[PDB]
Design a protein around this ligand. Structure first.
Ligand SMILES: Nc1ncnc2c1ncn2[C@@H]1O[C@H](COP(=O)(O)OP(=O)(O)OP(=O)(O)O)[C@@H](O)[C@H]1O
Ligand SMILES: Nc1ncnc2c1ncn2[C@@H]1O[C@H](COP(=O)(O)OP(=O)(O)OP(=O)(O)O)[C@@H](O)[C@H]1O
Ligand SMILES: Nc1ncnc2c1ncn2[C@@H]1O[C@H](COP(=O)(O)OP(=O)(O)O)[C@@H](O)[C@H]1O
Ligand SMILES: [Mg+2]
Ligand SMILES: [Mg+2]
Ligand SMILES: [Mg+2]
Lengths: 474, 470, 470
């Protein structure tokens, strides 16, 4: 009947008799009070995964089904809080007091509900904003090796998100809690906390919570995009999600696959990533853009999980420790990085300048590869080498210091037209900041023209302002 | 017929037990329709494809939709035939899922339409024809250096962000604009955003009415993403068998078809092979590409795109598909990041129909001279980098001078670039291509600045752009 | 209540509790038998439950050698997990996994407090963080990757690279100065190293501030598994109930997961990764998560991680890399070159290397050193392919200074006075940054490269060059 005894217990997994009316995915509750999900139905047993501290369960304990699927509480009051995958606060400060709940297992917006991506997502990082643009609804992947300045990009984009009316959810999977506290403090000291929500899944929390964490992340962004606001979602690690699912599948005795991963990995990651979209004007115009992270050993981005995620995403940002220790930060590989919304998700002046910038960088990328060996060369090769060197020099910027788009396009215009020819390479970094200060004090009208028009100012005014600053610099 | 009851659920996999013993055959279709009796139960509609028999009247089935909410003891009903996509004139200008039900809100196909089982025995040896007919695309690079063939399979290879989807979409538009033949598009696990953008772009183009589209979405179980290509092929099959004309079949990506096959094998419990791939790969690829054959009546030409995972042409899926191609066109990221659009590498793209007697001797001579100049330029670029263009002698100077122009003129603007750069686009017939390339080879336009050749169509457009620039 | 043993397979035993009562997971069981005849052997054993089975059956991991067990023997149930004696009494003494003392000096009475070893980790609100630098006097760590008080420190390296030398040098330097309780727990390390360290600590008198627990590698997997948890349990009381700062030293924690896989193969878990048990990350995360610094108390933990075949790609080091605030990697090639220690300058960086924490000049010197070392790292490949004569003048200067910079990072150590007979030195941070700035600006162009080898302070470089006769 509906009641049934537990016949096995181990490693967060149980098996039960009876339960002849259970449903796949149904929440099931024990006498200990811990919750779990039924995942496998057999001829006379049910495979249960436990969402909590399981050590208390013993053989002969009666287990009963709740009768519902897991629902994440949703509300406007969650903003600024730190929450589990379950709807329970872990920050203290009492209950969060949500309005209502939404099932995690839900269907995605299909064709003729979406619309083309046409409005940018500002990160404040010159290299990615110029050469690899992102627009709302775009599912941009970021991938690299350990400790290569990955999370600095997401933190900078969340800090710069203050400009645009977007909730920036941060979901941490399988990480140490002290890192969660450190990133929360880094967000709070820069004032970004009031428009952010942090979801934390500890490395020591039972694996099914790590299995369900990204769905609890998408639930809130989905509710907000239904309400009509823009949303940004960041996953700090999908590889740990894959490891948790592999472990929880292998304990269930499901057949393995390419690297002991079960057969459902691509199904699960596509189910997660397909909810990110850009709803049509009719629906309300919301957007749920995503920035998943993937960890890779020794930059072997050809491994199974990176291949899956790169075939699911609409672009990648390849980060390498080689450029990181080369002195070029953030270490973004322009050649291997691609984005398939490149022309639509930018303002017109950004497109106009960035096209020529990318052309110059592309030429230098091939010339520099072996021009270094030859000491003596003809003058035009020297000119192209210097152009590439100054190009790469300008892109360098300070950490936790996002730059407004208009100063980006002004300094990139200074770069592309060759105004930096006189400046020795070392002076360029000081030139950028002093140029910013000079345009702040004197050349404000250009910034007014850009902010109002959303297009490049008249050539004469920009040229006069840049040369006027160049007069003072030494 | 008699109902069957569920016994097991393991995600996409489901098992049924037909107690009385009248079992369905392999590849059949099973329907699950449930209405909740208590407030605890859910309503679900599910399609199941049989894959194996396990004895004791039990069968093992792969689901085409999400299996959440299943309950043991619910009845399953057997259709008695494979999944049957409705076909005929009712399928033109619409979008369908793997099951052949309309995704578009424009309406629902009625019972009047004839239905074709997707799974069908292949054409036999005696039926097939051997004649060769060239297909004109109007693209200078494709028409000049890699002609496509009616009934033959054409492959598009390249990395990410190089324009394979742009090329296939603009080729669909060009074919429907000029040749006017029917076409069918199958999206195997296409990005929902890209599918919707393609639908809107084709609707604006006025081409949808002539074509037909079927989509298998990424968020669906791997079995549906596998079977979507077969349902598209069944649409083209009915068009070719009854209407007897030159149908075309476009397939978004075979890579995801192979991946879905591997996932279904892993779920079913078969031992892996090669690089984690399913034991039966060559067979499935062979079937999917051998039902696409040109009989005497109709061609069913196909253009197919494939992604290279790590820039290595050795992964089992690219190799198996590589074995089956008549013409291969590979796209390079360096060309895509250069100003040269489209990004097609001339030297590495080949077609077995480039024989002089098939295309004509003038076409062969001009193509050979073009490739010779390109090879000499590629070799000379290394010297140019260190010592410059002035060090090499006059013959090398003239060779590189012509080579730069030929690389530029291989590019052209097209109608789909309206979104990306706002230019109208051009269409160049093959004779104009060979004329222009012969002219640039003979060098009547040595005086013209090189920039005039960058993105125009006909050579008189080079003349007009040279007039414009001054 | 008692249960009867029915199976024994190496480390694993199988008890059956037919009385109608079952032990919970992690419970401890007692085996005591008196030989009834000359054939039987007297045995004393303890079994911890790890899994459950249907017929009252439970699978238990044995803590000691299983030889001599007979089916049908009776197992006593303690009804509680493994209890460890913790308190002020533990200082000085040495204990085994079960909590029994090892030294013959004395015994622990019943009056002493004993508390279980298994418990949940601290919550989010209890944690706290700070950026205070923890000076070690080692040039590499101080200048290129500073450690932090209260931050986890990790040492990575293969067999025979110099890992233990760092452990002993750090323990000497910091334990001589800090007034914090120290807990040492060797996980499967050589017993001779434990005995030598015990003699050294008796010479240093620090034993009154130290408590020690040992799990030898020759001991069955269970002891190597639970010993780190026991040491952590003692450090837990010292951190929280006493409210005193504590330091936890652990050697080669990898043996924990090695023993876990040893017993997991017998436990019937399907294989995964490179033979590793499926539950690797959960257990390792539990153990590492319990080692945290709260507001009640702080734990500065220095650990060492063995790498199976000198390849960091292995899943256990990869999982460990995520749980560390500071990491220094040891490379065999540096050991072969003669540069000691073997910390690689281009792969070690702590969370504390920020301009505000260390100061502007320190950060700039560190980053210029790293840049120059990377440039040399590519120049060596260039030299191998092209030769050492084709480099440019500035490239010659870059290599010239890179050689001296990588040489100066070597330091004469304290504990190495036994191995080689040199005094040893303790270098302040300010001296490190000043010397590195001086060499970076090329003030010592004249000095030979060897003068920079194995010296404490730059004045010793000058003295060594004087000894050379320069
Ligand atoms: N612009 C920058 N300039 C200097 N250092 C930078 C810059 N951006 C990032 N970093 C460095 O990046 C490091 C942060 O590590 P990183 O963001 O790569 O971690 P992660 O591996 O992504 O972490 P997580 O475990 O949270 O996923 C710091 O040491 C910081 O100094
Ligand atoms: N600073 C140093 N100066 C001179 N010799 C050194 C130095 N550091 C290490 N060595 C030599 O290298 C050897 C490395 O032994 P060590 O015990 O440190 O190895 P390990 O890498 O910790 O591995 P294991 O734990 O397996 O013993 C020492 O025995 C010693 O001979
Ligand atoms: N011929 C072209 N004209 C204009 N833009 C192009 C062209 N080829 C490539 N692009 C640019 O590159 C992208 C091509 O996307 P897509 O065809 O989907 O690449 P892939 O097929 O490699 O995924 C477009 O967004 C466009 O901005
Ligand atoms: Mg990371
Ligand atoms: Mg594409
Ligand atoms: Mg050692």
């Amino acid at each position: 009947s509906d009641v049934g005894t537990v016949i096995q217990v181990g490693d967060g997994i149980a098996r039960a008799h009876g339960l002849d009316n259970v449903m796949s995915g149904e929440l099931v509750e024990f006498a200990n009070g811990v919750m779990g999900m039924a995942l496998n139905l057999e001829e006379n047993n049910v495979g249960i995964v436990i969402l909590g501290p399981y050590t208390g369960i013993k053989e002969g304990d009666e287990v009963r089904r709740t009768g519902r699927i897991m629902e994440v509480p949703v509300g406007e009051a969650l903003i600024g809080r730190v929450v589990n995958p379950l709807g329970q606060p872990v920050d203290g400060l009492g209950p969060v007091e949500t309005t209502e709940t939404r099932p995690i297992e839900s269907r995605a917006p299909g064709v003729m509900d979406r619309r083309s991506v046409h409005e940018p997502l500002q990160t404040g990082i010159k290299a990615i904003d110029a050469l690899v643009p992102i627009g709302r609804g775009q599912r941009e992947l970021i991938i690299g090796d350990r400790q290569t300045g990955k999370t600095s990009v997401a933190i900078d984009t969340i800090i710069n998100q203050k400009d645009q009316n977007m909730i920036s959810i941060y979901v941490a999977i399988g990480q140490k809690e002290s890192t969660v506290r450190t990133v929360v403090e880094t967000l709070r000291k820069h004032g970004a906390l009031d428009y952010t929500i942090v979801v934390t899944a500890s490395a020591s929390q039972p694996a099914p919570l790590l299995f369900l964490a990204p769905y609890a992340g998408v639930a809130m962004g989905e509710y907000f995009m239904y309400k009509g606001k823009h949303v940004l979602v960041v996953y700090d690690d999908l590889s740990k999600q894959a490891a948790a699912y592999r472990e929880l599948s292998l304990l269930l005795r499901r057949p393995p696959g390419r690297e002991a991963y079960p057969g459902d990995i691509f199904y699960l990651h596509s189910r997660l990533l397909e909810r990110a979209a850009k709803l049509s004007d009719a629906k309300g115009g919301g957007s749920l853009t995503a920035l998943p992270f993937v960890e890779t050993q020794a930059g072997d981005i050809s491994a199974y999980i990176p291949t899956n995620v790169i075939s699911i995403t609409d672009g990648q940002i390849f980060l390498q420790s080689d450029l990181f220790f080369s002195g070029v930060r953030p270490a973004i590989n322009a050649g291997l990085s691609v984005s398939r919304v490149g022309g639509a998700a930018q303002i017109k002046a950004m497109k106009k300048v960035a096209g020529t910038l990318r052309l110059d960088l592309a030429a230098y990328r091939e010339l520099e590869a072996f021009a270094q060996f030859g000491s003596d060369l003809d003058k035009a090769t020297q000119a192209k080498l210097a152009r590439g060197a100054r190009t790469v020099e300008v892109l360098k910027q300070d950490l936790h210091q996002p730059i407004p788009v208009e100063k980006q396009v002004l300094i990139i215009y200074a770069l592309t037209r060759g105004f930096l020819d006189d400046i020795p390479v070392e002076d360029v970094r000081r030139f950028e900041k002093e140029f910013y200060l000079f345009l702040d004090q004197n050349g404000q009208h250009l910034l007014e023209h850009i902010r109002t028009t959303k297009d490049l100012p008249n050539e004469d005014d920009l040229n006069k302002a840049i040369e006027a600053f160049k007069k003072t610099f030494v | 017929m008699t109902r069957g009851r569920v016994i097991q659920v393991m995600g996409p996999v489901v098992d049924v037990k037909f107690e009385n013993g009248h079992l369905p055959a392999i590849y059949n279709a099973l329907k699950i329709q449930h209405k909740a009796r208590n407030e605890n139960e859910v309503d679900i509609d599910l399609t199941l494809e049989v894959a194996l028999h396990l004895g004791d009247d039990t069968v093992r089935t792969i689901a085409m939709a999400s299996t959440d909410g299943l309950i043991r003891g619910m009845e399953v009903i057997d259709t008695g035939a494979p999944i049957s996509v409705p076909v005929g004139e009712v399928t033109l200008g619409r979008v369908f899922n793997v099951l052949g039900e309309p995704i578009d809100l424009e309406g629902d196909i009625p019972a009047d339409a004839r239905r074709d089982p997707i799974h069908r025995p292949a054409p036999k040896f005696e039926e097939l024809a051997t004649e060769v007919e060239i297909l004109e695309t109007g693209i200078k690079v494709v028409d000049l250096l890699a002609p496509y063939i009616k009934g033959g399979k054409i492959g598009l290879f390249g990395g990410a962000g190089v324009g394979k989807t742009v090329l296939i979409q603009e080729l669909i538009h060009n074919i429907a604009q000029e040749h006017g033949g029917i076409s069918v598009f199958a999206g195997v696990g296409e990005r929902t955003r890209e599918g919707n953008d393609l639908y809107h772009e084709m609707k604006d183009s006025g081409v949808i009415s002539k074509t037909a589209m079927v989509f298998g979405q990424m968020n669906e179980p791997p079995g549906a993403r596998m079977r979507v290509a077969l349902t598209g092929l069944t649409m083209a099959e009915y068009f070719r068998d009854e209407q007897g004309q030159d149908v075309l079949l476009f397939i978004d990506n075979i890579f995801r078809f192979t991946q879905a096959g591997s996932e279904v094998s892993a779920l079913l419990g078969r031992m892996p092979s090669a690089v984690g791939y399913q034991p039966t790969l060559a067979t499935e690829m062979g079937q999917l590409q051998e039902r696409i054959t040109s009989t005497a009546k109709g061609s069913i030409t196909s253009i197919q795109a494939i992604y290279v995972p790590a820039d290595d042409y050795t992964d089992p899926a690219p190799a198996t598909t590589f074995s089956h191609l008549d013409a291969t066109t590979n796209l390079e990221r360096k060309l895509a990041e250069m100003g040269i659009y489209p990004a097609v590498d001339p030297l590495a793209s080949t077609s077995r129909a480039l024989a002089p007697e098939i295309v004509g001797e003038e076409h062969y001579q001009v193509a050979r001279k073009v490739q010779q100049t390109l090879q000499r330029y590629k070799e000379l670029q290394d010297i140019i980098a260190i010592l410059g263009m002035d060090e090499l002698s006059d013959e090398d100077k003239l060779v590189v001078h012509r080579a730069r122009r030929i690389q530029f003129f291989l590019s052209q603007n097209f109608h789909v670039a309206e979104q990306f750069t706002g230019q109208p686009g051009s269409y160049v017939p093959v004779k104009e291509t060979v004329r222009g390339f012969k002219e640039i080879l003979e060098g009547k336009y040595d005086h013209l600045p090189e920039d005039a050749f960058r993105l125009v169509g006909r050579i008189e457009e080079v003349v007009e752009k040279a007039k414009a620039m001054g």
